[PDB]
Protein backbone atom coordinates (compact mmCIF):
# COMPACT_ATOMS: atom_id res chain seq x y z
CA UNK A 1 0.00 0.00 0.00
CA UNK A 2 1.92 2.50 1.88
CA UNK A 3 3.71 0.12 3.47
CA UNK A 4 3.83 -0.28 7.13
CA UNK A 5 7.31 0.22 7.29
CA UNK A 6 7.55 2.64 4.96
CA UNK A 7 8.42 6.18 6.69
CA UNK A 8 10.64 8.03 3.90
CA UNK A 9 10.99 11.79 4.97
CA UNK A 10 11.92 10.43 8.76
CA UNK A 11 15.44 11.59 9.81
CA UNK A 12 17.88 9.36 11.51
CA UNK A 13 17.70 11.12 14.74
CA UNK A 14 13.55 10.73 14.69
CA UNK A 15 13.79 7.26 13.04
CA UNK A 16 15.84 6.32 16.70
CA UNK A 17 13.83 8.14 18.84
CA UNK A 18 10.14 6.39 17.37
CA UNK A 19 11.43 2.69 17.49
CA UNK A 20 12.93 3.12 20.84
CA UNK A 21 9.10 4.52 21.70
CA UNK A 22 6.32 2.11 23.94
CA UNK A 23 4.83 -0.84 21.66
CA UNK A 24 8.28 -1.84 19.70
CA UNK A 25 10.78 -4.30 20.86
CA UNK A 26 13.83 -6.78 19.10
CA UNK A 27 12.94 -6.61 15.39
CA UNK A 28 11.16 -3.56 15.17
CA UNK A 29 12.01 -1.64 11.81
CA UNK A 30 11.74 0.88 9.25
CA UNK A 31 12.61 1.95 6.00
CA UNK A 32 13.34 5.71 5.11
CA UNK A 33 15.02 7.71 2.78
CA UNK A 34 18.71 8.12 3.30
CA UNK A 35 19.88 11.62 5.36
CA UNK A 36 23.50 11.53 4.32
CA UNK A 37 23.82 9.75 0.92
CA UNK A 38 21.05 11.22 -1.18
CA UNK A 39 19.23 8.40 -3.45
CA UNK A 40 19.46 5.72 -1.02
CA UNK A 41 17.42 3.97 1.78
CA UNK A 42 18.51 3.34 4.93
CA UNK A 43 17.30 0.70 7.19
CA UNK A 44 16.80 1.61 10.67
CA UNK A 45 15.99 -1.29 13.31
CA UNK A 46 15.40 -2.40 17.37
CA UNK A 47 18.36 -4.52 18.48
CA UNK A 48 18.97 -5.85 22.07
CA UNK A 49 22.82 -5.19 23.05
CA UNK A 50 24.50 -7.59 25.70
CA UNK A 51 25.81 -5.11 27.98
CA UNK A 52 23.84 -2.00 26.59
CA UNK A 53 20.34 -2.68 26.27
CA UNK A 54 18.08 -1.35 23.75
CA UNK A 55 19.77 -0.02 20.55
CA UNK A 56 18.80 1.55 17.33
CA UNK A 57 20.92 0.40 14.20
CA UNK A 58 21.24 1.44 10.60
CA UNK A 59 22.03 -0.18 7.32
CA UNK A 60 22.40 1.42 4.20
CA UNK A 61 20.02 -0.12 1.19
CA UNK A 62 21.78 0.77 -1.89
CA UNK A 63 20.56 0.48 -5.54
CA UNK A 64 21.80 -1.84 -8.13
CA UNK A 65 20.72 -0.70 -11.49
CA UNK A 66 17.63 0.27 -12.22
CA UNK A 67 15.22 -1.82 -10.47
CA UNK A 68 17.47 -3.82 -7.50
CA UNK A 69 18.09 -3.26 -3.71
CA UNK A 70 20.93 -4.67 -1.59
CA UNK A 71 22.42 -4.24 1.62
CA UNK A 72 25.15 -6.73 0.99
CA UNK A 73 25.75 -7.79 -3.18
CA UNK A 74 25.71 -10.86 -1.90
CA UNK A 75 22.10 -10.62 -2.67
CA UNK A 76 19.62 -8.80 -4.02
CA UNK A 77 16.11 -7.87 -4.38
CA UNK A 78 13.49 -6.67 -7.16
CA UNK A 79 12.11 -4.78 -4.48
CA UNK A 80 12.37 -3.77 -1.41
CA UNK A 81 9.03 -5.88 -0.31
CA UNK A 82 11.32 -8.44 -1.50
CA UNK A 83 14.28 -7.52 0.50
CA UNK A 84 12.04 -7.11 4.14
CA UNK A 85 10.29 -10.60 3.49
CA UNK A 86 13.90 -11.77 3.09
CA UNK A 87 15.11 -10.44 6.23
CA UNK A 88 12.20 -11.16 8.22
CA UNK A 89 12.46 -15.00 7.21
CA UNK A 90 16.18 -15.05 8.83
CA UNK A 91 18.15 -12.25 10.41
CA UNK A 92 20.93 -13.58 7.42
CA UNK A 93 23.95 -11.48 8.90
CA UNK A 94 21.78 -8.76 9.92
CA UNK A 95 22.36 -7.81 13.50
CA UNK A 96 18.33 -9.36 13.76
CA UNK A 97 15.40 -10.58 12.64
CA UNK A 98 13.16 -8.21 11.32
CA UNK A 99 9.97 -8.81 13.22
CA UNK A 100 7.11 -5.99 13.43
CA UNK A 101 6.56 -2.19 11.17
CA UNK A 102 7.44 0.67 13.85
CA UNK A 103 4.56 1.45 15.52
CA UNK A 104 3.28 4.89 15.28
CA UNK B 1 30.08 10.54 8.40
CA UNK B 2 27.33 9.08 10.61
CA UNK B 3 28.07 4.90 11.52
CA UNK B 4 26.47 2.17 9.50
CA UNK B 5 26.24 -1.30 9.84
CA UNK B 6 27.49 -3.62 7.34
CA UNK B 7 26.67 -7.75 7.25
CA UNK B 8 30.09 -9.73 7.67
CA UNK B 9 31.60 -11.86 5.47
CA UNK B 10 32.31 -15.38 6.72
CA UNK B 11 36.41 -15.33 6.79
Known sequence: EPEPWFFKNLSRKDAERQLLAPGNTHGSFLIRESESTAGSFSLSVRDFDQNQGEV???????????????????????????????????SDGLCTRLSRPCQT | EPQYEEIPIYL
Open chain 1, 56 to 90: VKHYKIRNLDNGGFYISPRITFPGLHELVRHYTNA
